[PDB]
Symmetry: C2
């Protein structure tokens, strides 16, 4: 290791691998919102959205939930039994907007995901449109 030493610089977002070429982007600034980043070349074209887009994102969402990465606006961790509408920009590796992901958790067993290419976020929005703390 002779010579200089490597140091890590502080980044805006910390990327956490959800699998299927998808990353959870968590901003170091706790005041700004979580994003998702697609690195998979088979998900580069957001016009022709096929079922495998849904199947991969399904897996990434489950992982995100297992990791307990998201918490409600009250500060409480999103726990099974809860229901919500959670939104996030999906960007590529050059931070370009691809679509908005809508995640609609209905109960502990089922969610609906929807890709909305035309829904733009306002600067001051968080990730939650709505939620409901359940059993």
């Amino acid at each position: 290791s002779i010579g200089s030493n490597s140091i890590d610089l502080i980044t805006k977002y910390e990327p956490i691998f959800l699998g299927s070429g998808i990353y959870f982007l968590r901003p170091f600034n706790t005041d700004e919102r979580d994003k998702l980043m697609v690195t998979d070349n088979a998900m580069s074209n957001w016009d022709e959205i096929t079922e495998t887009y849904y199947q991969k994102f399904g897996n990434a969402i489950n992982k995100m939930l297992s990791l307990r990465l998201v918490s409600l606006p009250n500060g409480h961790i999103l726990q099974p039994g809860d229901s919500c509408v959670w939104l996030a920009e999906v960007v590529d590796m050059k931070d370009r907007f691809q679509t908005t992901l809508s995640l609609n958790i209905l109960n502990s067993q089922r969610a609906e995901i929807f890709f909305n290419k035309t829904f733009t976020f306002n600067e001051d929005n968080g990730n939650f449109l709505s939620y409901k703390i359940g059993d």
Copy 2:
């Protein structure tokens, strides 16, 4: 408040949903629907009580009965459909009160949520998501 802002009445056709709640349908094809509250007992959006939910429940049902809401594809929102539909709730002077989130799960149950801090971007429609 006794009367509506003029800019409001030139831009939207109000349609009574009942409960001092109006559907505001823009004349311009390319604009989104709003909701207007005229009821004095719903003037303060900090202290939101159960009757806020009860009146809006009724208004939403009437809105659906009237078939006022249609998807992008022009499909009229029919029973069996599910969705996430949003709209600004304004007062008679066109001032933002809250954002209404409407989550329809099926032919029976919907959830409504009032979100005072969710601001709409100019280019958004009312639907965040839907399922036919």
